[PDB]
Structures are given as C-alpha cells and as structure tokens.
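Each lists sequence, tokenised fold; shown next:
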Amino acid sequence: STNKHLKNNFNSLHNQMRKMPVSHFKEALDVPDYSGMRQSGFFAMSQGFQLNNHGYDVFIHARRESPQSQGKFAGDKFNISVLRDMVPQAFQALSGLLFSEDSPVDKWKVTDMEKVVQQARVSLGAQFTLYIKPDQENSQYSASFLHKTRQFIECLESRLSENGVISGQCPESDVHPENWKYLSYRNELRSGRDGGEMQRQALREEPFYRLMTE
C-alpha cells in the first residue's frame, strides 16, 4: 500500500526532499472570487477545474478535469481553518494557488458560508479541504511530489499570514504542528472508534504527516 511504501522509505524520502530546491507555482489570475465561487451551481469551469455548488450540499467542489495524480486516494487531506467572517478574503488570497496549473491538489472544496449556521462548528474552521493523492500509477508517493505538496501547503500558510488572515477553530480530530496557523492534517482511511487525544496521537505518527512537518 501507499503507507507501507512510506513507512519503508521514510528516511530516504525525507533525505531526498530536504535537498530539493524551492518549488514554483505559476498562480492563475483568471479565477472566480468567493461570490463567483458560490454561483458555480450545477457546473462551471475555471483553469481546468470543474466547479459545482449543488443545492443538496454545503460545499463548493473543485476537481481537475485532467487529474495530475495517477494513484489511488490513500486518505490524506488537509483542512484550512480561518476566522469565519474572513472566508471570502481568504479564498481570494488562495485562489491563484488553488487554481494553479502547478498545484499538486487535483481536488478541493470550500464551504458555502451562506448555507451553514454561523454558530455551528462547520462555520468556524475547516472551511477549505485539500485532497491529496499519490502521484504515481502504482499509488506510491514520489519524493518530488511530497516535496511539492509540502511546499504548496507552506505557500498557503504564508499567503494567509501575509494577508493578515486570522486563524479559525482547528477541528478536534485533526493534528497540526505549532508553525501551522491555518492548516491541519487528517487521514480519512483510519479507524476512528476513539477520538483525540487517541485519534490525534495516531495521526501524529503517520509517515505522510511527519514528512510534511519535520
């Protein structure tokens, strides 16, 4: 599996990543703002990402028409949590990167703030989700892609930080290190019969997560 490969190539991948030069992402300009995002409705396109805001859900989904990751989803995702009323400014700041032709994220979503109750937790954090997929057809992460993914995430962090965006409420079930102010990590394909601190400490030991943080 994806994770077995990570476990057995843990050090090798870390050693390869730390030697790679900075990644570049050509950000898109011809993109919707947050209001435009909410108006995607049944179907819309922007920069090769298919958009939809279906009536029966509370999220606007973005999916590459031509996925760049050929592997099977292994459960890894990131949430981004900003202050509820700063979602529109946050989305605009991140939009060039989220729609970038160089982005390692084929699939993501942003909460439609007008469909959810303001006091509900769904308004207060995790208003963006990024789905990560192993790049290779054999479903193993390559070192260069791990590097690119970590670089991308860190670019999201500084962009928000440089825009003076205020942190949101981190989801109980995610984990993040101290130097992540908005990003948090969760793996969906893990047993969850027991909440954090239990679930959280297991997540902290995920090789994907440690390669993103150490």
About this structure: The domain at 1-17+40-214 is CATH 3.30.2430.10 (Phosphothreonine lyase fold).
